Design a protein around this ligand. Structure first.
Ligand code: HEM
Ligand SMILES: [O-]
Length: 153
């Protein structure tokens, strides 16, 4: 749906996030985990995790932010013609993971806070919205598939 220009904005921020992937993932992760305790409850490999200290301390977390950020970018860069990557994920998330669209949204949040937090100058409003647009988009499709599938309350 989103504009030539908007993709523009959405993309350059990416390239920046690409500078320190693991950092960001860790970031987003922690944000998410702190803000929506429910979300972490769902990762078996992480539940053990008690403090912010612990989190940033743990390497498997690290790796984890990585796994995610990667899939994420892959989609962005596709400027909406992201089907290739999304499908599998929607299935994965709906069928084993058990992740609520609410999470996608949740996560989505930490994402932009994180982005904001880490790029004061680079990310004013023009960027912020593009970014948000992009996200609901990811949100939209993954939602659809869910339906198809019988998920999505
Ligand atoms: C930004 C959106 C996200 C992306 C791109 C994403 C991507 C991925 C990828 C690529 C995998 C591993 C291969 C696979 O299972 O598909 C994965 C595994 C998983 N993800 Fe997601 N994820 C996202 C958000 C979330 C959220 C919000 C939760 C929890 C609410 C979550 C929980 C999990 C769990 C539990 C696993 C298996 C975790 C593990 O490997 O043990 N993901 N995710
Ligand atoms: O994830």
């Amino acid at each position: 749906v989103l504009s030539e220009g908007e993709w523009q904005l959405v993309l350059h921020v990416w390239a920046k996030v690409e500078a320190d992937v693991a950092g960001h993932g860790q970031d987003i992760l922690i944000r998410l985990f702190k803000s929506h305790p429910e979300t972490l409850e769902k990762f078996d490999r992480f539940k053990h995790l008690k403090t912010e200290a612990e989190m940033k301390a743990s390497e498997d977390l690290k790796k984890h932010g990585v796994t995610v950020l990667t899939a994420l970018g892959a989609i962005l860069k596709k400027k909406g013609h992201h089907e290739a990557e999304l499908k599998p994920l929607a299935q994965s998330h709906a069928t084993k993971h058990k992740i609520p669209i609410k999470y996608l949204e949740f996560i989505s949040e930490a994402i932009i806070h994180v982005l904001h937090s880490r790029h004061p100058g680079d990310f004013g409003a023009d960027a912020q919205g593009a970014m948000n647009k992009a996200l609901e988009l990811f949100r939209k499709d993954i939602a659809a598939k869910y339906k198809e599938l019988g998920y999505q309350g």
